Amino acid sequence: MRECISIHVGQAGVQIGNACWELYCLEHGIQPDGQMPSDKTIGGGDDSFNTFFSETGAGKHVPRAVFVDLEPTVVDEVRTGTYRQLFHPEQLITGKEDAANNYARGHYTIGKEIVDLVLDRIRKLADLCTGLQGFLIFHSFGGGTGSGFASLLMERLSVDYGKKSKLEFAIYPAPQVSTAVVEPYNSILTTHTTLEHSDCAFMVDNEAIYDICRRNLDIERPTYTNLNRLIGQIVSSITASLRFDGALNVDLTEFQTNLVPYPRIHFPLATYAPVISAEKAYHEQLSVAEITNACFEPANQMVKCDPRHGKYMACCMLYRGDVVPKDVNAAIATIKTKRTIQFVDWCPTGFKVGINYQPPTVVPGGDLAKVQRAVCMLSNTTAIAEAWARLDHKFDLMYAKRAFVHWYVGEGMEEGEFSEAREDLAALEKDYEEVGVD
Amino acid sequence: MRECISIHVGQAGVQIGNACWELYCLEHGIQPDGQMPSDKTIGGGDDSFNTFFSETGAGKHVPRAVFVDLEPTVVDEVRTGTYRQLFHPEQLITGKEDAANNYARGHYTIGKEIVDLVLDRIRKLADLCTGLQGFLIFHSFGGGTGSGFASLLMERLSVDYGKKSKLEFAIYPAPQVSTAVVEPYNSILTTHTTLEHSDCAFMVDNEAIYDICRRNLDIERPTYTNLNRLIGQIVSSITASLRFDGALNVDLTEFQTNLVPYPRIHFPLATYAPVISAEKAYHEQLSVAEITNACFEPANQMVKCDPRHGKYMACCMLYRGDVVPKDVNAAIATIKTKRTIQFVDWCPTGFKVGINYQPPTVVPGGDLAKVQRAVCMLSNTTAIAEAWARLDHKFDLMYAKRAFVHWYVGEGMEEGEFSEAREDLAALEKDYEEVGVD
Amino acid sequence: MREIVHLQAGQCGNQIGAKFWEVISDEHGIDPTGTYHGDSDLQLERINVYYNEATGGKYVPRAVLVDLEPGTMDSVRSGPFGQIFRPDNFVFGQSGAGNNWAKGHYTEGAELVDSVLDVVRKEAESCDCLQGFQLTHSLGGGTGSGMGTLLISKIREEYPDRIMNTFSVVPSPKVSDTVVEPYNATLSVHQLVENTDETYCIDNEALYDICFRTLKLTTPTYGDLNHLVSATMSGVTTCLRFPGQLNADLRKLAVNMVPFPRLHFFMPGFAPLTSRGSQQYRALTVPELTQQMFDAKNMMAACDPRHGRYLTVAAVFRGRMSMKEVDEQMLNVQNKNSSYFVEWIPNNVKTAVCDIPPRGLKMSATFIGNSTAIQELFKRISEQFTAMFRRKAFLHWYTGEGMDEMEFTEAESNMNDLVSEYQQYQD
Amino acid sequence: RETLEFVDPFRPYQSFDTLKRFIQYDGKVLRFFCLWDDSTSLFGDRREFV
Amino acid sequence: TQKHNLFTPEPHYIPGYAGFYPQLRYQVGNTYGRTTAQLLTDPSVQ
Ligand SMILES: Nc1nc2c(ncn2[C@@H]2O[C@H](COP(=O)(O)OP(=O)(O)OP(=O)(O)O)[C@@H](O)[C@H]2O)c(=O)[nH]1
Ligand SMILES: Nc1nc2c(ncn2[C@@H]2O[C@H](COP(=O)(O)OP(=O)(O)OP(=O)(O)O)[C@@H](O)[C@H]2O)c(=O)[nH]1
């Protein structure tokens, strides 16, 4: 049936995946013990959880996700958390050594002896699955262990399974903030390796996530908890179609068909319009018009891109809650009448709507609003090529002065692969204006 | 009727027989005294024990086994144990002198004056028995007392009783671990003596039993108590056909006919699929598919052989518990669809299934799981010859430099018998080859 | 049932035999008077391997004492356990030794060998079936060397069917005190290698080095040295007397350690030795036991086998261990120094694990070594013999006794044959 | 499913024993004194048994 | 040492064991049981 498997590689990607399952157990009302109250939803594992959890005759929900990391500190800590009884011990694949931010160390030195184990997990999860539309991969481009390990496993799952979908989600590197200077080194290594195998990649940047927090959420001092709950809401919204239904039901297969124009570039942008603090939503009203203005207001994007400097290709909107096609179609029509919205002439239509009646729920101990009508806005524009334009002039300098190469060549590589990525990157930009130029 | 006699030779083979009888009384609920409660099961010796125990009008269940040993240390201690009242005193056949690992010392020096005694025991056991399908022999190859004494007695019981089955079970010598350098001496001596008389020799290796313990049982420091329990479960599963019925009932005679293809080679491999920890089985589910995957997973074999380096001839699975033909026949059909498992083209069908309804129970103070569906996997493959291939290149070096020969020629022997066995082995590998050649 | 009768010889054996036996009584908890205080059931089963029964729960040690000088026995008798030894088992002579080996081998032994044979067969008939015998003495010990060579030869044709152990201490290489000692040792070893099968090699200098290393107590008593080696000697005997899944018979052991007949000489090895504060500074783990077990410093027998290679190794572990750690420890050391063994035989290890700890500690062990480290020993004595045989020093005595230089020729030639034999097998 | 509960084999059987009670009450006899009237017949009157 | 015990109050000790049994020197009796019946009956020393 309609189920999937999630992947969370790296200490970066494990705390966020933890929050998602924390959120996911909430709307399903899953108790931290592992079982419901005297009410009956258990069986052969076939209900709203059959797509996410695995609650067999034992009555314990087994989430369909694998957490892999190379350092035991955080994973053992969450192994001592609140839902650890729910979590499968060796689905929480731990490690004893790190990649030291080195792409190839996590790709050559240690990834060999651990991938065989996780493949057993994948196949032993594959057999119990029925339809398994695809995979939910959560990582980070600046992965000290997320980057290198994922590149190894993603091609391994691609070569044996090239018939099903693979969904990619990672933090985009901060355009002007760098907590690591080898991060641009490994990031371009991941991109050029993933471009020919990654199906649909989606990125996000924390700075504007922070910027939103003190703009409208009005929190000048949030924490990761807020960051994880926001993206957890994002993945919840895209997965609500799997959980509930609405006016029309849409699937990732429709998303991949209706978003990516051509091969290579598969990098659209997600956005959630009703990001507002609580105290506001009491005394104002929400409707499709303003949130449509909000989701298309450029400053509400979490990626530092000026859409006026680019051109729109596709726009996929997922209205979760009580909406009607009438105001929807009328409002988006006014958007089409807008002149500043410069779509490419190649797309007469570029709108992909998915309706779900279920209202978005608040989280206990949270800071969000009380949303009845919500949209997660998925779109791809040509204003993104500047981001890679930032990386290459960042990249070309240090490669020319070949910093830290002694580290990389010290444990066994050469610069030719670093050479390949540069025209792999270069081919990306030249393509972007070529498709950008009508 | 459906009964058998068990034989336990070697102070190595004595503790395992104790554990099996310890296990055997639990599913029968036998109290250590020797009698059930006031409930009515005693009689002329006819109930579930009749195939194993001898609970006559005296009301005391007498196991149909013979413990034979030559060092009174362990046998006296177990005679001070818990069920010693159940055990028959001179059925606990003891000796006052050892064989010093020497096969022929245990085959010539002292075995002559004791075999007549045990011969009296077997006939006095034979007369009381009714059908006595065959014998159950626990022994060892590298036996300080297991090797030499068993060889003489199996010669004597074969010539007078050559019309019934004899079931052989010995710990296979560890390939790269050696507790004694004379172990190759007696081991190949035993093999060449047994090949023309032994009916069904089944081998195990402790290393992988240990390897299993910290893979899935997750015990880094187990003991023999666990080791004997694991093999004790194995013999329990094969004997469950005698204890209970099933969807179909299978017997060693069917096992003998359907397993061994051709004379000489009668050396299959056994494997128990649901070996897992209590908590793992607690929040996980067992079904025919994944356990069928597990039993054919190469690392789950207790013998260090790669089936991809060999080819399959016979495969017997003994499903114990609540199972149906539907999933089982479909699963094995999918197994036949698998390409990696390379059966020989000679056998289109090589799958012998024995269904038993009785679920495998847990043991008090044990480490096993709560199994409802279990299978004992008996199979024979050509990947076994590497073991003897390992054996011979160890022997050929050592026989060339004739180490320890003064020990053997000192107490009565020569080199011809040692010479004779090596071409027997050299026959074994060459016989193992053309059968592997299609 | 299979038992052992002990032979006490030499004036060194006078001290070790007392120390060796009192440890056993203390280990089994018998009071000095001899009335057993029932505390341990396993020792309540297995003193019959070594002791017979006296009236009133008294346990006669089945050992025989032999010497010439009465004062040594009187000190032994006036010891803490002289009462538990028998005046029946005290055979001696009416002569002073002067540790002329020939006198004890030809002159003094003749009128005493008859009596000692009578006593031992009386003891031998008192018991049912032996594994065999063991002897405590010194190879360079004058009166002990003279008597044993006679006794070992006599008991050869007597009972050529039993376990024929020998426990001798090597004199100090740096100084032998006795200057005719190299004559005494060379004479004895000629017949020893003919008559013996097992030989323990012990040297005092190494024991002196051990005291400087772990005992660290400046000035010890020779009894403390006797305490160490008696414990090692007791350890190899613990395996017989105690239960647990480990194989006990020395023949179970000897065939595994002895590849060729001429191999009789063996190097002991013992387990944790602890210093001033390390009792409360040590975490007892099989890894650190295994490390300390295979330490050239922990060695005490002859000298460092580092200069050579390892033929056979056998270590018995005493206490609450398991089959897995001993297995992985053997693999670790197997991989640790793979080259330092001989390519003739791999997996040259023979492991036994005694589940019963000693009284006071839980995890202990003992090791017996057969490596290429004995060459320098008889190489050392080779120069001494040749130098002293170069100009027949101190020789008129033995000619007066009735000895001739021809005997000395084959004794060294026998020794020289061993030099090539040990060399040829490894080098 | 009671038919499928009927499809649930357990292999039962039963037998007996007499030794223990024999041993328990070995060498034990009860003794009582009684009377039967025979005067109903015109020949005999009475007789006493134990 | 740190261990457990044996020689539980008779009747025990099936014939066959190897070992000395305290004050076994006055076996005017005949059976293995009767001896052991009295032997453990006599811890009277202290
Ligand atoms: N996904 C994620 N990223 C975070 C989070 N907090 C900070 N980051 C950023 O994500 C990056 C983490 O990547 P890595 O440091 O390479 O993690 P790793 O590959 O598993 O290896 P390590 O260096 O040992 O952590 C950091 O550079 C941070 O800038 C978070 O909560 N989740
Ligand atoms: N069957 C069995 N084997 C064991 C056990 N524990 C260890 N072993 C192995 O089995 C071997 C025993 O063989 P032997 O030593 O010749 O045993 P034996 O012939 O009865 O005579 P002994 O020398 O007294 O033990 C040892 O080398 C161990 O490696 C056990 O509990 N059962």
Ligand SMILES: Nc1nc2c(ncn2[C@@H]2O[C@H](COP(=O)(O)OP(=O)(O)OP(=O)(O)O)[C@@H](O)[C@H]2O)c(=O)[nH]1
């Ligand atoms: N008892 C004893 N013997 C020692 C000691 N130190 C070294 N030895 C040597 O142990 C040797 C063996 O003793 P015996 O065989 O009884 O000596 P012996 O035959 O009586 O004659 P000598 O060797 O000349 O004393 C002696 O030769 C001593 O040199 C010690 O501290 N105590």
